[PDB]
């Protein structure tokens, strides 16, 4: 077992091909399935796992009532092989209402945040044991990525924020070796609010695309140097912006450096990645709600401010159907590093009042150098047939 | 771990012996069990797995209503060790309403087709990662074997069709190395319609027996050369024909080359294999419906046009009970390659209107060089005791 | 991985200590648990597994009605790690209404009998593949041990019977190498009826204690020489006899050679083993019914005809509670071979008419060279609280 | 695989960080989950497992009625990976109404006590086989730790008691090598009543902190020398005492040697460990009931009689919520041995009469050298929403 270095070129990407779907809401109506939100995917050198924050209950269960809330002492991080739905034999790997996980080539790191809003604790669990912890620095909901961290040569990086959801906050990037925090770098650069980073290896460093919850509907970028620990930050250049809410495609803007101040408050976790001058990105189809999901390439979208020249659109979830969070993960192939993404498909309250609970299923796609057609892969639960 | 070459002689076969049964419909009445159809069996060098296309629901579940339909975005390929029924802890290995899987000696390949009828995508997943994809070439339900593919020296072959179910279509044979499509050969030869191939290693190549959905109640043969990529095709010589529907045993014919034009439209997935001049084959007992299942050898049935000299009949499922799809798989023994087969036992709509769902169980037999008796191994669900 | 030779002395035994219990009937009232009978235990070099013949249904299931019957096409052999109850994720390793399993040091052999009463088939499955089969020789319920077979230096032995349950029958001992039948020896010697043998390694050969269903309430012994394939047989010398039904302890007899002709018809699977001149044995406490279970040593019970000098009695199941089948298994320790046994605890019809089903749980004890106390470990299901 | 020696220094501890929670009571209301009590945690060199004494039933099950009782023949020791709740696929590793388990670096030892109150048997199971047993010496509820044993260089130690719960009893320390009892040392020293020891490696020996059920609300210490087999004992010096019941913090006392005679009768399993002159310890917040759970360091609490100088308090379970048993486990890191603890969260009768059953969930924390905040992690079941 050697440490991952991710020192291969990024794979050619012509778009994305179907990879996985768990259909967990449909199954919940005829089986004991965990209530979840904030899912993600991360893979060890051999195989992929799906993760989510449990609500400490199954769906067909009186405890599922009012599971819309984000933070309780009963939330734990679930971990199954990808494609295995969260049944009662699912392992809860730590106590968490915010998490990030990654494999360094040798073992799994889990970063798990729980406790009081005003004084939370993050535990660092590596190779099945607790190695480190840190208390809240700003005493206002310490929180992390809700997707995979990234490790190079045994140094794993994870982005965490503490402080306001609607003003300047204190974001820090932790460097972790075999579960031990060896360095913490405060955020630097021009990103003005950073949450829920979707990070990927871009040898020799790590690159993240995140959520600005304050003034931006354009997505922040954070670049992390694992050798000198320097942090830089800015915004995705693309004038087709990635956050929800946002303005329409003709009114939206981004000039690469500053929050656009266009329906900037609130947000959704999302992702994008660079290919030379171009960007690949996903987003909800709706500009207001977490409904629909589309991916596309913006020509010049990485290096040219405010570019809106799109190509290679794919519908992942049709506009009539609910989506949610999305995030990136990276998979090492024979000769290149591939980029994949998941979409959380949220069902229940508050939007759907037919039931009392709030949960999600997942759908997953991976980059391809081949060809593909079209479809739509929504949750598929019939809200009127569900246990309430 | 070395690549499979399958370079051993075929085992002596005197008939088939019971190997596995999952009883999943009976269990569905008292437990959370997936709704499935189109099952199959494939084995790695150590052990066998059962596969099926899920309907994204369990049977005792309101979502099981009207699961007769062939293609939805909720269908996924299930994979368990053979004999483990599709319980809620079953892994969904990809999104699929048509699939083929095989192990090359080192890792599993899955071929999975999903998306719009008119523009489907096939994903190629090898060793737990997406390696390739292809879009629909004829824009009319791209589809594949619904049974195991076959790999020799690391080249895996899979037969796919796109186009009409009731006229000339575009069948292609893909050659896949570690999940990457390295070559695609169009169908050639005298088979006029080819679907749902049951393929087996016949060193140095691959041989398939398939479904003609158009003009043949005789089964097509496709031979695949993995070195020069040439394809040839014809029909099983046996005058006792293998498809359903078909004419009676006295009226039926085949002359080895052309569809017989005898109740040729429609069909069922099935199998046959050669032993010198003789053929072993299975088929439904009913000539009209997917009811009963019998196996036998036809003396001269491989090389003599229209031979009807049968011997070594076995009843697998009595004529009063429902069958369905069937297919071949191959298992490497100490000194020879054995041939085995599964039978899908379909229950529910449209034939049985007592329930709203459509599902199946499975029964599995393997070739033997020993002796055996008689029996009948049907599904065993009591349609009047089932959840509706 | 080397073949087991079992070439160590038998461990010192002062009695038996509790090893396992699965409590499956109690669990069946609040969970999806298989309906079973005829359970047994066998261990690979590392760990033990529990086995049973399923009835192709869970208990809380309409299909559990009238599961008293011995033989159906839905019965399969279940296999879990010992102590894991037969939940819905349990593997069905073959189709069987009669079975025997054993590990040769390298891999598992399963012997599985299914099909028509008058023309059954036994499949031989080794290392996950079908290697051999044999048809019924006497056309009257081919059947086997319902407990572990035994392998020495890669030759596995299994005792099978075909023919009358109430007159002279045709018993044969099969010698099996990597799943292939290499030799079959007919029963020889003075045992007049032999069923359901409980066999154990007694280097350099195999020794079995069985059920006489015809004229004996004394238990037959069959000795198997794995080098020259010779079979000899007689009866356990002990005047305290092991079968049910039987006469009382003062009226019972055995003189080592012939069936005692004392309430000889019918029987129950059971076990005994030798220690020099002494015998260890178990039996039901009731002389008429399968109720209670006791173990003891008979001083002189192996070599002295009709000895009744007992010592070291233990109650395993109190006389007020139901038992059933019992059988031996052997476990290799550091320096000796230990002997253990299981007891099937049968619940339901026909004896208990409060429910419609027939099932069992299990309890397991192992020989000890240490000390122990007393107890009683019955099924524990409350028949009046069970699903019907 | 080498034997554990635990020959590293104890880790720096500044307090404890969240590690695991299973939420099993909440899940029990919508899924088949075992009824348990007396849980614990023990880890092999790679990963941690959770253990508990089952009641031979799931919670949503008529057999769960009146599961308040401590000892039945249906109780078994359950073992899952830590964080996997006790679902129906959980392994029952032995028959037990009292247990201790530990891994010696090569294999698992289980110590399991069952049978009649007046004549119980303890089985010693190592590497999946029964190696030894001992009968009750004092004929009055032979019993053990209900938490992990400890092994050094292949010698495992376990503390057992037989005799009165309310007067002088017969405690013995067993030394076990590969499952075989090689030596038994009677308790010696000034501890006057010793039950339910929480033991940890303190190279070159083993140290335990236990429950005095008779005259002490201060906790006994037992030190075990694994080389010369000598036993010494006393009481934790801290004037803030660890048992429940106890007097208030101002009235309580301990002078290190003798039971304090302060509300000494009854007790709860608990833990403490030394760091030079200081002690870390947990206890219920309530002085009368098993409610709340707090941890803290007492400065001088190991070596200075009656010290009450506390620092580094953490609330684990708020005072309004139920706790129960607690115990220590040790985890080997890169350069030091860490100390962790679990808390049993008891729900149901007799305290909560809304339901008929008695069960528990668990929460687990590990020592940290980092920082942390605050929270409360109670069971979380709504007693008014539970199946009864
Ligand atoms: C079977 O499946 C395949 C694979 O999914 C699918 O092919 C894909 O089709 C989509 C939709 O057409 C393609 O994505 C589009 O790409 C165009 C640019 O490509 C065209 O123009 C260039 C340059 O001239 C040519 O080289 C090229 O050949 C094409 O002709 C983008 O313009 C598209 O974006 C617009 O349309 C979207 C809706 O489709 C809008 O959502 C989006 O906002 C854009 O609209 C606005 O921008 C336009 C200018 O960009 C302008 O007209 C207005 O401002 C407008 O309002 C979109 O990204 C994708 O590349 C194809 N994939 C591949 C690999 O070929 C097949 O269509 C499908 N067949 C069926 C019937 O199912
Ligand atoms: C216990 O279990 C064993 C194993 O399953 C079983 O033995 C098997 O019996 C079946 C049924 O008889 C055998 O299969 C048949 O084989 C004959 C040919 O074999 C005979 O003829 C040759 C050549 O002269 C002899 O060497 C040989 O010894 C036999 O006498 C086929 O003719 C059979 O096919 C016909 O009958 C079927 C129904 O059984 C029809 O479905 C089928 O359509 C065929 O019917 C038509 O063809 C006939 C000419 O072929 C002619 O009469 C008419 O056209 C007719 O309508 C069938 O394949 C099988 O070989 C045996 N297996 C072995 C290994 O021996 C025992 O019977 C069983 N016992 C019981 C009581 O359960
Ligand atoms: C705590 O747990 C331990 C371990 O389980 C338990 O000890 C065991 O007790 C049983 C029951 O007494 C013992 O088994 C009996 O052994 C005697 C022979 O031993 C005695 O005699 C010899 C020779 O003189 C002495 O060396 C020895 O010290 C003993 O005194 C057998 O006779 C017993 O069989 C008879 O009684 C059974 C009921 O207990 C009947 O079911 C059985 O049919 C026998 O009855 C008939 O035979 C008698 C002559 O054999 C005669 O009296 C009449 O014919 C009669 O009707 C039985 O096998 C066992 O050896 C002990 N185990 C060990 C290791 O010591 C403790 O008793 C237990 N304590 C409590 C209170 O729970
Ligand atoms: C965010 O999260 C952090 C980490 O959990 C938390 O910090 C921790 O706070 C607790 C509670 O204050 C600290 O534990 C206490 O420590 C004091 C001793 O520390 C003080 O005094 C020393 C010596 O002068 C100073 O060096 C040091 O800086 C501190 O000022 C103990 O006295 C505390 O025990 C008493 O209070 C408890 C309730 O909090 C009682 O339950 C307990 O019985 C004690 O009460 C009695 O004793 C007193 C003297 O000891 C005396 O006043 C009376 O007799 C009294 O009745 C307690 O152990 C802990 O050390 C902090 N942890 C760290 C690592 O700093 C933050 O508070 C938290 N913030 C929020 C708002 O959530
Ligand atoms: C995209 O949003 C812009 C900005 O709101 C829309 O432009 C406005 O449209 C209304 C008429 O519907 C006018 O009264 C306003 O003067 C416009 N505002 C500005 C600032 O231009 C535009 O219509 C939207 N485009 C689409 C296609 O919906
Ligand atoms: C097999 O099918 C053939 C073809 O239909 C049947 O032959 C027909 O039988 C009817 C009488 O029932 C006659 O009126 C027709 O003239 C026949 N047609 C031909 C073309 O021969 C034959 O009877 C069937 N055999 C069996 C055993 O059912
Ligand atoms: C054991 O069984 C024998 C054989 O039946 C019993 O002896 C019989 O008892 C009855 C009186 O109850 C007499 O009328 C018969 O003459 C006896 N028959 C013989 C052949 O002796 C004996 O009583 C039984 N022993 C016990 C303890 O139940
Ligand atoms: C702790 O317990 C002590 C001992 O009972 C309490 O002291 C008693 O308090 C009552 C008044 O409430 C007096 O009448 C007794 O004289 C006291 N007894 C002794 C022996 O001192 C003390 O009040 C308790 N402390 C707290 C904070 O509850
Ligand atoms: C720690 C926490 O509660 N994070 C929140 C997150 C957060 O409110 C925003 O990013 C603003 O800061 O929003 C959302 C959301 O759906 O918008 C869900 C997350 N829920 C959970 N991770 N549990
Ligand atoms: C891709 C697809 O829908 N294939 C069909 C197949 C097909 O309709 C015929 O071969 C004609 O082309 O028929 C059947 C069938 O039962 O006849 C089931 C298959 N269902 C699934 N594989 N899902
Ligand atoms: C193959 C078969 O049916 N064997 C029978 C067995 C048999 O009837 C007797 O030994 C007489 O021959 O009896 C019993 C029994 O409980 O007495 C159960 C077995 N049931 C099963 N193994 N399924
Ligand atoms: C063997 C046994 O029954 N031990 C008891 C234990 C015991 O009563 C006291 O320590 C007094 O001796 O108390 C308790 C308790 O909750 O106080 C539970 C234990 N239950 C179980 N381990 N099953
Ligand atoms: Ca925003
Ligand atoms: Ca056809
Ligand atoms: Ca008999
Ligand atoms: Ca006490």
Residue numbers in the entry:
A (entry chain A), B (entry chain A), C (entry chain A), D (entry chain A): 82 to 469
Quoted passage from the original study:
Of note, the structure of SD93 NA was determined in complex with zanamivir. The backbone conformation of the loop that contains residues 385 to 389 is highly conserved between NAs from Bil69, SD93, and Mos99. Although N387K decreased the fitness of Mos99, it reduced the titer of SD93 to below the detection limit. Briefly, we constructed a mutant library for SD93 that contained all possible combinations of 10 mutations (n = 210 = 1024 variants), namely E248G, R249K, I265T, Y336H, R338L, N339D, K344E, S346G, E369K, and G381E, in the genetic background of N387K. Mutations E248G, R249K, Y336N, K344E, and E369K were enriched among variants with a frequency of >0.1% in the post-passaged mutant libraries of both biological replicates, suggesting that they could restore the fitness of N387K in SD93. The virus titer of E248G/R249K/Y336N/K344E/E369K/N387K could be further increased by the addition of K385N. Our results showed that N387K reduced the Tm of Mos99 NA and SD93 NA by around 5 °C. An interesting observation in this study is that while SD93 NA K385N/N387K mutant has a WT-like thermostability, which indicates proper folding of the protomer, its enzymatic activity is minimal.
Neuraminidase (NA) of human influenza H3N2 virus has evolved rapidly and been accumulating mutations for more than half-century.
